[PDB]
Amino acid sequence: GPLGSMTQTFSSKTEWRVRAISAANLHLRTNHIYVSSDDIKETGYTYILPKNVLKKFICISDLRAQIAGYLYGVSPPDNPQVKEIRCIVMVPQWGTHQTVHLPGQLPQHEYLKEMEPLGWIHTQPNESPQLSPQDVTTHAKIMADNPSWDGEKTIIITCSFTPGSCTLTAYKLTPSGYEWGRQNTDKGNNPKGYLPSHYERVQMLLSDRFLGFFMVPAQSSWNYNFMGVRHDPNMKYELQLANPKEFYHEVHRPSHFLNFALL
Amino acid sequence: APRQVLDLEDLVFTQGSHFMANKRCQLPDGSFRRQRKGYEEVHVPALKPKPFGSEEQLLPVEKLPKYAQAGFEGFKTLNRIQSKLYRAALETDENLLLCAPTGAGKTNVALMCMLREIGKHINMDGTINVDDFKIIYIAPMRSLVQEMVGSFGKRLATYGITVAELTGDHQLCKEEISATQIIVCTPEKWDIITRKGGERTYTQLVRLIILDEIHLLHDDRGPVLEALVARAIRNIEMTQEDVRLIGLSATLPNYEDVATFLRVDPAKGLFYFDNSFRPVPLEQTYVGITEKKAIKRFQIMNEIVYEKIMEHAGKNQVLVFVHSRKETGKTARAIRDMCLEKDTLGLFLREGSASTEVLRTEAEQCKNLELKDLLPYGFAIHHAGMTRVDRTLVEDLFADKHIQVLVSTATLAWGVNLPAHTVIIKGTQVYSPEKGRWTELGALDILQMLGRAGRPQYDTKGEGILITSHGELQYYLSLLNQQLPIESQMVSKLPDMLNAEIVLGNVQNAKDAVNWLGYAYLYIRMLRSPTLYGISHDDLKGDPLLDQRRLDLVHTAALMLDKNNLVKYDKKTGNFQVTELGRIASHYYITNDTVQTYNQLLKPTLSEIELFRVFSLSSEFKNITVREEEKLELQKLLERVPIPVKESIEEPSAKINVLLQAFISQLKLEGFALMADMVYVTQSAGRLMRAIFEIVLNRGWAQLTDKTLNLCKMIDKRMWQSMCPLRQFRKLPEEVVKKIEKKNFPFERLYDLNHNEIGELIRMPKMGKTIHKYVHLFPKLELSVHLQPITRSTLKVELTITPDFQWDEKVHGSSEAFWILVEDVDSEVILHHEYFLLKAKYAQDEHLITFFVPVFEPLPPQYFIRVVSDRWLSCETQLPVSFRHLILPEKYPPPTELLDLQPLPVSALRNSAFESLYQDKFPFFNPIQTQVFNTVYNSDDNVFVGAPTGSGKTICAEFAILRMLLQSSEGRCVYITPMEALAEQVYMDWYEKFQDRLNKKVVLLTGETSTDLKLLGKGNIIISTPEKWDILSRRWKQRKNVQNINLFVVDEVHLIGGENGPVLEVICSRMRYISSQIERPIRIVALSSSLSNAKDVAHWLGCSATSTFNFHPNVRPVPLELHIQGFNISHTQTRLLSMAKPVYHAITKHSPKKPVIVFVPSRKQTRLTAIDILTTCAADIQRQRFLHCTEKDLIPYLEKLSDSTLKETLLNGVGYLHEGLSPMERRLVEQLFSSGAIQVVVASRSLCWGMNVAAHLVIIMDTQYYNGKIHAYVDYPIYDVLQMVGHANRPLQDDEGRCVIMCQGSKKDFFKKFLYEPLPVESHLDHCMHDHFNAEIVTKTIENKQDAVDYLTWTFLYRRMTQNPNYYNLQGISHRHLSDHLSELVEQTLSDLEQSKCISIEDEMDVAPLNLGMIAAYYYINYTTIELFSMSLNAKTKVRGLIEIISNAAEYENIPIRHHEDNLLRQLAQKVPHKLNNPKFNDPHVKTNLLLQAHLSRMQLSAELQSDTEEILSKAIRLIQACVDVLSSNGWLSPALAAMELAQMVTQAMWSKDSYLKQLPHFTSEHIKRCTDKGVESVFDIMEMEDEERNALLQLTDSQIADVARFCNRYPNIELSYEVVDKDSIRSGGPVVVLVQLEREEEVTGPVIAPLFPQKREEGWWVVIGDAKSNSLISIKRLTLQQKAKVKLDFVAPATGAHNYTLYFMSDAYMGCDQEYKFSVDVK
Ligand SMILES: Nc1cc(S(N)(=O)=O)ccc1O
Ligand SMILES: Nc1cc(S(N)(=O)=O)ccc1O
Ligand SMILES: Nc1cc(S(N)(=O)=O)ccc1O
Ligand SMILES: Nc1cc(S(N)(=O)=O)ccc1O
């Protein structure tokens, strides 16, 4: 029963610092990257993700907030059933642990015009058996706004953090799933109408035989999780040929530096 | 011996300068103690001076040497101690030690020493040779350093001496060091400078080092002084150039040991003056306080200071020294408050004196608030945290005796000359962040502060009051009364100090380290007082020199350095191996435990979090602790810092980390411990982080390199990159830059705005223009790349840097530095990096950088080129280099199979005379010669032979010649080799073969046209370098002997790819073109190293595939074992050090018994590597194993050598070879090597083409050399390396050859690609077109632009353009791509020729030669040279005008060996009779400018510089003749004849001296004085004399008069007659035809005698009709004369004036031979 006599004083213990410390060890997980192989019948397209940009993508991410990248690629000369992933494009974004917020404007750059869009890739805090209803809605809406996204040809790669590693699994939307996601407005974890017949496992392979590359915003950086107010679904942006800075880099959180100086 | 590992910590004096070695203390007579409540007082009275015994007068300045009297300007006498020291200081070079009480005049004795040194360098011109010496003045405190720069500069100004302090940056400061004669710096700065070993260091010039306050030896800093002195003395023996050492010491015990340490003769240069020599006597008061309780002791101290002050209030000024910045104010306020309470504030200030009003006004006008509170009462504070104007306020007001009580810091004691009658030292405790705690004041501080008591001419006594704690009394008493002995603190830094000597190569093993430690002051103290240093007296008597003790200390230090991976230490041998880590530790002044931590924790994956943590773990910070009382203010900072801190506030590393982060953010901390700790941490952050930067950059770690360079710039600029870069302009206002940061737009958003949109964006418009200026002041670079594939795996990159910002030396200084980083796909590896310096003189010019990077298949998407400022934050340009359209050359074809034919007997030649050439030297030919013989000897097909150096391709050429000699009795074979030294070797062998044996004619082209034509006619085998054949074969339309060539052999044709390749490509293309004109073909034979694109060379030269032998490197007849060893040291001198013992080990591993050549990069390295090989031999399993003949046989060879070191090394079996050796010295060494007498020879890289020895083992010691023009290291041309490797080849003696290449690791890959595989070569003709196009337009081979395109089709360039388009900047190989590219090249070349007035272009299609182009082509002179001649010359240019004009010709970019020789030529330039504007060394044209005047005035000598003189003389005659032609064409007579006689001057080596007798052999000035005395000034005069009268006039030898008479018989004696045809029938505007006839008389069959001129010459003459005073040059013809010759001259009459002309007959070779005949011609 102490008021004033046994006094104690609160010292702040801010959260992003612990997440920054743990993000500095992300590189450990890139030596243990597992693709789930539960797909069968080698039926559809086969997607080859180059290891070099996969590992960079993991290293620039956060263990809690999702990040996302647009996939661009091409078929090998005489193998139309294989889609090679040649480029990962990082656009201005923010995210939570369940979803990602991207602009409406898809990537637009001369270097990309000979490639075809193959979907997107996003980190995830935990493995899940099913594809997310958030993912199904996001893919669906991009598809309804952008006819260059063929539903038979664009995929979602989930990169799920397991303790010790990452697991990669690749899905695509079905026609049922497109039609559902594009009219869906419930952002919760179990919206009305959602179904496992809305998506389908596609086969995925990690390769060391060629290298991919990144494109990133021209005038800003990609990470707006510290500037969510300066982010906008309508925001426009250009691109340049360059490798993304990691999640907690100084240019993503300038207020921390300018506000520590004004202390 | 059985060594022991010591514990260094147990040997260390932990007290530092507070260690008191003496057990007892005796006070001056009259001292007395006095008790008081809580404290004791010791009083020591003032000492009486010695009463001027020894009849010592003060030396009047008048009695000094007259050159030293200016440094004493405005004094009447030297003081007393200067007077006792003047003989030793001024009249001798003895090393000095002077001990005197602080203030006695030691610094003035030091000035006298400096004056002696200065006097060593005054000439008769009165000036000082200020470039011939440096003087280092070492002073303990930076503030003292600046005060001395001031006082010394002002005293020495009248000499033109420059005194300066070394600033912190490193590249502008060496520029300053070059013009600084007296460098004033601290021990640590001189240590860090002389730690970096770079031979172009100016430390070579240092002649005198002054060590002021050398009693710092007792401080923790003292080991630095020990290291400096030891390094300086060992180096004096290393070079035998003396250095004078002067030590200035307080009067303390062990001064005799200090003098031993400085190599002072006690009897000659040791002077000890006791404390009675204090200029103002010192009553001293020591107050020692007994109270232990903080509160009571603090109050007692304030009490004692008040009482002491009151003893002086209104009678004396009192200077109180306290310990902090804040304490000055706290203490002054305490004292004056205690005065206020006791009504005593009035003793300090008289109410009726203007002093009070001055104080009130200056207070009210003052910026400082404490100075406001205090100045009215007469209390002042002074410290480092104040304004310069406020500090000068307090200084001026204290000197004016306005302030009565000045409380101040130690900075004032050191930096300002401000004495006070009374000084109080208030407490002797001080906080030391390094020690982590409160310590006692350093002894140097104490001495200096009490030295400030007593004003030298205002007071009769001074009063020093030291207030300390009682238990310290003895200490301070000892210190201030001559009794605190000076000890060595060396053990405390022994590992660090040892590593530096290992890094410098001064200590290569434990024996060296023992010797080195023998120069330490530690060593002398250990000998004189062993038990002080842990040595029992029995230990000493059993080890009298302390050999075993020093070996043990060295062993312990070595093992520490080895545990931490700075050195590899072999316990068995005692050897020490340097490392990159050790080098960085030494060069960045980092203690060895820190670099072990950095090595242990640095990883390429490190984030800013771990980077800050790694920094905070440095050992510099090991004593820092987290005090409970700071834990609160640190918590506040820990949970807001922008870089998260993993570990707890309980850890020192987290306080250190937070402190750095607060310093970058510029935060104000409140704890005083915290603020002092932050200062200590951040003051070393910079260089610690720069060491990290260098480690990770050299390891190639791109992410971490970027982060650490960044953190360096944040530390230096005190801001994060998040901040607007614009705040790096201090001149900008914080307000507006914060407005801009608040507006949150990209900084680059500002580049798109005029000055108005800038004001509008930032919501305030008044500043649009100023912001616009600063926006475009910020450094910014544009980048573009030309990608140039070499193979499918190696890519040459040419990077253009275009500056895109306004320069302004107020903000940029004189240079800006950047890093160029080439980074792979993922931005994780630095494929290539280098330093880039944008100099102000080039601020607007594009810069071109070239380098190689690896590539692979499948091609990666892109690389990146980052160019980053080395100092500006947010200052970077990154260029993606994409590979989406790169065109790779096709993979090269298989080599030609070596066929394993039966070895071919000489018998196959079926010709007894022919077989006589080879029969004695071998029975059979080698497999390659066997394979090619059938084609070369039994056919006429053009043939290509490609094979390694040492394959015997020269006998293949001989096969082709022998065939020629059977087809055509008078066959002409012309043989081109790309090097002159090679040409001379081939000429000496082919003379013997084809002239001595086969009785054919073999000639070597000299390069003079008239003689080379005769050689070409009369020779069957004609040997020439490419340029000498270019000059001849340009005129093939009018020279039948060039077309009548049966055989054209070209050797080392792979050098088409190299620096002088265009000329070689062109002459080969021309020989193909001629062979296709004359329709009787010239056979071509090409010899080459193994080429990957041999097929293209063969196609270009018309070789069928059946006659192209493209052999691979592995078919070398003597099998080659090639080893490439990588060395990961990026500092050249240290990398060479680390190669030194590997050189020896390679000799013993690959060639213990057989000959060895070591190629080293410099002349200097030949001798050092020879000696080091000898040193390593002497301590090995074999000694003298390299000498294979007895000592007796070697003696006649030793007699003839002038180099004595060469004779020592030759005795021990090792020779060397470099440019500076006389030619016969080199011959002696070469034959000793050939005969087997010596086993090893160390040659310089520059000799790798002219060596006529070979070896079983070649070692290439490093692959880079220093270019002094560009001040940078340059990679050996690959052609040089192949030529060096080719020296490991003895076909008659060895079963194999062996080669070890030692190189920087960053070069290993390149060599493995381009030595184990055949070489791809390319043309660079497209970069060397103009002078060849110009020749072909004179010669009418190009008459229009279409012609230039067809011409280009004949060349190697054109072939390679379709095979490797990207290399030549083509983007396709289609017919039209080629046509447009050819057209562009043609267009731009012809445009440049036209703009230079060398050619004309009519109808934009047709081209024609102009006057200038014709002169360029005839004299074989660069078209830009002839242009610059037209622009520089004048119708009345001086002879010296010519001298410079020709000196700036493009032909003269060749000598950069020594800048200091040109700094000596600054003095040489006064003597030369010719006068111009400025001397600027580091420019090959100025070396030419001066090395010519040296020739004409027969000035002095040198070795390599004389071989330079000879290559300038190889072009002077052509350049002079070109000027003569330019002047004649324009019409200007005067300078025409002036240049005609300048030809005479350069040939005969004499100026315009009227006496031509200097041309005669064996003649001297006295000979001319006597000849002129007897009436003889002409050569014809001496030969007209009766023989005996001449023999009496000149003192003569028989051979000497015979030489004179040879000259007089070759001297021209030409009789001339002129006939004017139609002498009386000529109308204006009509023909004046003058026929002149020339009769040599006597006889002529010999070249021009001219010993001073290297090349042989034939006499040439100009006949020139002109008119003087009008300068109307009319008609001139050039002629060569053989006894009789007649010539016509043409003129068109200018009027009917009917007047006179002068006629000139001018030699180009002899002076005095010039005739002048006057003739008048009336019109009609
Ligand atoms: N999924 C998983 C994998 C590993 S691993 N590949 O490091 O051994 C460790 C823990 C895990 O939960
Ligand atoms: N060149 C040089 C000069 C010196 S010193 N003490 O004379 O400045 C020491 C070492 C050196 O290698
Ligand atoms: N130019 C040249 C070439 C060769 S070799 N042995 O490669 O054919 C030997 C000596 C030489 O002077
Ligand atoms: N790995 C490495 C390489 C080099 S190198 N080969 O550039 O001189 C220097 C230092 C290093 O730590």
Structure tokens, B1289: 């080849």
Using CB distances shorter than 6 Å, the residues near ligand 4 are B 580, 698-699, 1128-1130, 1304-1306
Helix, coil or strand: residue B1400:
strand
B1658 contacts: CB under 8 Å, gap ≥ 6: B1008, B1010, B1011, B1647, B1648, B1680
Cα(A220)–Cα(B1180) distance, integer angstroms: 65
B793-811 burial by CB neighbour count: b if 16+ within 10 A, else e? ebbbbebebebebbbeeeb
Cα(B880)–Cα(B822) distance, integer angstroms: 10
B608 contacts: CB under 8 Å, gap ≥ 6: A250, B643, B707, B711
User: Does residue A165 contact residue A29 with C-beta atoms inside 8 Å?
Assistant: yes
Structure tokens, B675: 């603020």
Quick one: which of A167, A177, A88, A82 has its CA closest to A135?
A177
Q: What sign has the CA pseudo-torsion B1034, B1039, B1043, B1048?
A: negative
Widest CA span in chain B: 132
User: Helix crossing, A133-145 with A175-182: angle to 10°?
Assistant: 90
A-chain residues within 8 Å CB-CB of B607? 24, 246, 248
Residue of A29, A62, A221, A257 to mutate, testing the B interface (most B Cβ within 10 Å of its Cβ): A257
* B646 inside 8 A of chain A by CB: yes
DSSP secondary structure string, B984-997? HHHHHHHIIIIIII
Q: What sign has the CA pseudo-torsion A173, A177, A179, A184?
A: negative
User: Does residue A263 contact residue A75 with C-beta atoms inside 8 Å?
Assistant: no
Structural domain for B576, as ranges:
8-16+489-587
Quick one: which of B238, B397, B420, B219 has its CA closest to B321?
B420
- Gaps in chain B (C to N over 2.5 angstroms) fall after none
**Beta pairing class for A165-173 and A199-201:** antiparallel
| Residue in this structure with the two tokens 């000959």, named with its chain if needed | B1155
Q: What dihedral angle (degrees, nearest 10) is formed by the CA atoms of B1542, B1547, B1552, B1556?
A: -140
CB atoms within 10 A of CB B747: 14
B1518 contacts: CB under 8 Å, gap ≥ 6: B1419, B1420, B1421
User: Does residue B1564 contact residue B1595 with C-beta atoms inside 8 Å?
Assistant: no
The reply to whether omega before B858 is within 30° of 0 (cis) is: yes
Atom of ligand 1 nearest to the CA of A34: 6
Smallest Cβ distance to B642: which of A18, A211, A256? A256
Q: Does residue B256 sit in the same domain as residue B357? A: no
Quick one: which of B1010, B1063, B1015, B1003 has its CA closest to B1041?
B1015
B319 contacts: CB under 8 Å, gap ≥ 6: B406, B407, B408, B418, B420, B422, B423, B424, B452, B453
A-chain residues within 8 Å CB-CB of B748? 219
B92-101 burial by CB neighbour count: b if 16+ within 10 A, else e? ebbbbbbbbb
Q: Does residue B1105 sit in the same domain as residue B1005? A: yes
Question: Which segments of chain A are extended strands (E)?
Answer: 33-35, 46-50, 68-74, 82-89, 94-95, 100-101, 116-124, 155-162, 165-173, 199-201, 203-207, 213-217, 239-241
What is the rounded end-to-end Cα distance, in angstroms, of chain A? 37
Q: What sign has the CA pseudo-torsion A16, A17, A22, A25?
A: positive
Q: What sign has the CA pseudo-torsion B329, B330, B335, B340?
A: positive
- Burial class of B1593 by CB neighbour count within 10 A (0 to 12, 13 to 18, 19+): middle
* B747 inside 8 A of chain A by CB: no
CB atoms within 10 A of CB B271: 20
Cα(B1411)–Cα(B1430) distance, integer angstroms: 11
Q: Does residue B1170 sit in the same domain as residue B1192? A: yes
B206-217 burial by CB neighbour count: b if 16+ within 10 A, else e? bbbbbbbbbbbb
Query: Is residue B101 part of an annotated ligand binding site?
Result: yes
B968 contacts: CB under 8 Å, gap ≥ 6: B1046
Query: Is residue B102 part of an annotated ligand binding site?
Result: yes
CA–CA min distance A144, chain B (Å):
32
Cα(B294)–Cα(B289) distance, integer angstroms: 12
Cα(B784)–Cα(B878) distance, integer angstroms: 10
Q: CATH no. for residue B1101?
A: 3.40.50.300
Cα(B1092)–Cα(B1098) distance, integer angstroms: 12
Structure tokens, B721: 């990159």
Query: Is residue B334 part of an annotated ligand binding site?
Result: no
Helix, coil or strand: residue B622:
coil
| Residue in this structure with the two tokens 């731009």, named with its chain if needed | B1388
Residue nearest ligand 4's atom 7 by CA: B1306
- Burial class of B1100 by CB neighbour count within 10 A (0 to 12, 13 to 18, 19+): buried
How far from B452 is each of A94, B136, B281, B412, B1318, CA to CA, in Å?
Answer: 67, 26, 12, 10, 77
Structural domain for A103, as ranges:
1-263
Q: Does residue B1168 sit in the same domain as residue B1268? A: yes
Cα(B1075)–Cα(B1043) distance, integer angstroms: 8
- Resolution, rounded to a tenth of an Å? 2.4
B1266 contacts: CB under 8 Å, gap ≥ 6: B200, B1132, B1161, B1162, B1272, B1273, B1274
Q: CATH no. for residue B499?
A: 1.10.10.10
Backbone angles phi, psi at A121, to 5 degrees: -135, 135
The answer to whether the CB of B949 is under 6 A from ligand 3 is yes
Bridge partner list, B138? B185, B211
Question: What is residue A198's DSSP assignment?
Answer: G
Structure tokens, B1113: 């490197």
Number of domains in chain A: 1
Q: Does residue B98 sit in the same domain as residue B214? A: yes
Cα(A241)–Cα(B1324) distance, integer angstroms: 33
Cα(B300)–Cα(B467) distance, integer angstroms: 11
The residue in chain B having the minimum alpha-carbon distance to the alpha carbon of residue A252 is B722
Residue nearest ligand 4's atom 4 by CA: B1128
Query: Is residue B1531 part of an annotated ligand binding site?
Result: no
User: Does residue B634 contact residue B674 with C-beta atoms inside 8 Å?
Assistant: yes
Question: Which segments of B1438-1569 are extended strands (E)?
Answer: none
Cα(B69)–Cα(B61) distance, integer angstroms: 6
A-chain residues within 8 Å CB-CB of B640? 260, 263
Residue nearest ligand 1's atom 12 by CA: A163
Which helix or strand (DSSP H or E) is residue A210 part of? Answer: none
DSSP secondary structure string, B1178-1220? HTSS-SSTTB-S-TGGGHHHHHT-S-HHHHHHHHTTEEEE-TT
Deposited experimental method:
X-ray
The answer to whether the CB of B451 is under 6 A from ligand 3 is no
B642 contacts: CB under 8 Å, gap ≥ 6: A250, A253, A256, A257, A260, B661, B665, B720
DSSP secondary structure string, B755-781? HHHHHHHTT-GGGHHHHHHHHHHS--E
Using CB distances shorter than 6 Å, the residues near ligand 2 are B 194, 201, 203-204, 206, 231-232, 235, 243
The residue in chain B having the minimum alpha-carbon distance to the alpha carbon of residue A213 is B861
Q: From ligand 4's centre to the CA of B1305, what distance in Å?
A: 6
CA–CA min distance A145, chain B (Å):
30
Cα(B1495)–Cα(B1549) distance, integer angstroms: 6
Q: According to the 3-state scheme, what is the secondary structure of B1003-1051?
A: EECCCCHHHHHHHHHHCCEEEECHHHHHHHHCCHHHCHHHHCCCEEEEC
Q: Does residue B303 sit in the same domain as residue B414? A: yes
* B642 inside 8 A of chain A by CB: yes
Q: What dihedral angle (degrees, nearest 10) is formed by the CA atoms of B312, B318, B323, B329?
A: 90
User: Helix crossing, B547-563 with B510-517: angle to 10°?
Assistant: 120
Query: Is residue B1205 part of an annotated ligand binding site?
Result: no
CA–CA min distance B595, chain A (Å):
23
Ligand nearest to the CA of B1053: 3
User: Does residue B501 contact residue B223 with C-beta atoms inside 8 Å?
Assistant: no
Half-sphere exposure in the Cβ direction for B694 (13 Å, CA)? 19
Q: Does residue B1132 sit in the same domain as residue B1182? A: yes
B274 contacts: CB under 8 Å, gap ≥ 6: B47, B101, B251, B482
Cα(B720)–Cα(B608) distance, integer angstroms: 13
Residue type at B1617 in one-letter notation: S
Structure tokens, B361: 């006004």
A-chain residues within 8 Å CB-CB of B860? 211
**To 5 degrees, how large is the angle CA B1053–CA B1056–CA B1059?**
130
Q: Is B928 left (phi over 0), alpha (psi -120 to 50) or beta?
A: alpha
Widest CA span in chain A: 81
3-state helix, strand, coil in chain B (%, to 5): 45, 20, 35
Quick one: which of B292, B304, B296, B376 has its CA closest to B338?
B304
Q: What dihedral angle (degrees, nearest 10) is formed by the CA atoms of A253, A257, A258, A262?
A: 140
What is the rounded end-to-end Cα distance, in angstroms, of chain B? 111
Q: Does residue B466 sit in the same domain as residue B515? A: no
Bridge partner list, B209? B136, B245
Cα(B384)–Cα(B397) distance, integer angstroms: 17
DSSP secondary structure string, B675-720? HHHHHHHHHHHHHHHHHHHHHHHHHTBHHHHHHHHHHHHHHHHTS-
Half-sphere exposure in the Cβ direction for B545 (13 Å, CA)? 7
**Binary contact (A250, B642; C-beta < 8 A):** yes
- Gaps in chain A (C to N over 2.5 angstroms) fall after none
Task: Kindly tell me the number of DSSP H helices and DSSP E strands found in chain A.
Answer: 5, 13
Residue type at B1591 in one-letter notation: N
CB atoms within 10 A of CB A100: 19
The answer to whether the CB of B1297 is under 6 A from ligand 3 is no
* A interface with B, Cβ–Cβ below 8 Å: 11-14, 17-18, 20-21, 24, 27, 52-53, 56, 86, 111, 209-213, 219-220, 230, 240-243, 246, 248, 250-251, 253-254, 256-258, 260-261, 263
Q: According to the 3-state scheme, what is the secondary structure of B1051-1087?
A: CCHHHHHCCCHHHHHHHHHHHHHHHHHHCCCCEEEEE
Cα B1711 → chain centroid = 43
DSSP secondary structure string, A16-50? HHHHHHHHTTGGGGGGSEEE-----TT-S-EEEEE
The residue in chain B having the minimum alpha-carbon distance to the alpha carbon of residue A247 is B607
**To 5 degrees, how large is the angle CA A204–CA A205–CA A207?**
150
Half-sphere exposure in the Cβ direction for B1146 (13 Å, CA)? 27
User: Does residue B726 contact residue B630 with C-beta atoms inside 8 Å?
Assistant: no
Quick one: which of B117, B116, B37, B538 has its CA closest to B287?
B37
Structure tokens, B1311: 């060599």
Determine the residue of B922, B949, B979 to mutate for testing ligand 3's pocket, defined as the one with the most ligand atoms within 8 A of the Cβ atom: B949
Backbone angles phi, psi at B577, to 5 degrees: -115, 125
CB atoms within 10 A of CB B399: 15
**Binary contact (A261, B667; C-beta < 8 A):** yes
User: Does residue A75 contact residue A84 with C-beta atoms inside 8 Å?
Assistant: yes
B-chain residues within 8 Å CB-CB of A217? none
Question: What is residue B721's DSSP assignment?
Answer: T
**Binary contact (A246, B609; C-beta < 8 A):** no
Query: Is residue B953 part of an annotated ligand binding site?
Result: yes
CB atoms within 10 A of CB B741: 17
Q: Where are the alpha helices (DSSP H) in B342-464?
A: 345-348, 354-364, 369-374, 388-399, 410-415, 443-451
